[PDB]
Write a structure and sequence with these properties.
- This protein has 2 helices and 14 strands; from the N terminus they run ββββββββββαββββα.
- With 221 residues, it is mainly beta.
- β3 (48-56) and β4 form a beta hairpin.
- The longest helix has 10 residues, at 211-220.
- The relative contact order is 0.13.
- Residues 81-141, 164-218 form the Tudor domain.
Length: 221
């Protein structure tokens, strides 16, 4: 099921309704909540500010918190397909909803799956049924994630350096700030499965974490 294009609607948050919100750390998993209160503040200059008292669902004791609509996401998937730069939560396969940004829309070229650049740095092709929209849009969506996601979206180009690879080639690859020897063991459209030196990772073929991309990006700049 491929949704049609159209306007992305962000309906207001309704009291007593179920949503997803940050559990602990913002970059980490988002879980089921019920909005139990709506708070609003207005200053002399006229700038309003909205906050939400949320209650976590399925807990051992009552857990309540006050968050912003930027830390809440809808419970059901959008009725229309999403585009590059849209801030979402996507079901990552621990298996959970993690915050991210749409890096590729539904295309024939990617078998109609969104490429997700997760906040935590993980990347995955997720179907439309596994994404949820964050309740509040960000003008400069990088201000919400990290410095790569700024250059990717603000200085976006279809002509960005991407590695072209084949199962069995090797290249220097960055893992937790360390450049290591890694081997191409699988490829899935814009993603490449790199096996370090047991230790495997799906990395974006246009990532600076791959030695040849880094050089190519320095050579052009």
């Amino acid at each position: 099921e491929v949704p049609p294009p159209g306007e992305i609607v962000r309906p207001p948050i309704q009291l007593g309704e179920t949503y997803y919100a940050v559990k602990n750390k913002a970059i980490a998993s988002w879980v089921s909540i019920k909005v139990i209160e709506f708070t609003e503040s207005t200053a002399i200059n006229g700038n309003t500010m909205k906050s939400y008292k949320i209650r976590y669902l399925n807990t051992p004791y009552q857990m309540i918190k006050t968050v912003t609509a930027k830390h809440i996401a809808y419970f059901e998937p959008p009725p229309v397909r999403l585009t590059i730069g849209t801030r979402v939560i996507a079901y990552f396969d621990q298996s959970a909803f993690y915050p991210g940004i749409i890096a590729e829309p539904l295309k024939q070229a990617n078998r109609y799956r969104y490429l997700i650049f997760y906040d935590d740095g993980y990347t995955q092709y997720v179907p439309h049924r596994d994404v949820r929209l964050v309740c509040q849009a960000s003008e400069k969506v990088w201000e919400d994630v990290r410095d790569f996601i700024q250059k990717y979206v603000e200085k976006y180009s279809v002509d960005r350096p991407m590695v072209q690879c084949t199962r069995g080639q090797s290249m220097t690859t960055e893992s937790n700030g360390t450049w290591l020897y890694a081997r191409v063991i699988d490829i899935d459209c814009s993603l490449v499965l790199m096996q370090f030196e047991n230790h495997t990772e799906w990395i974006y073929r246009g990532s600076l974490r791959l030695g040849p991309v880094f050089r190519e990006t320095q050579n052009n700049m």
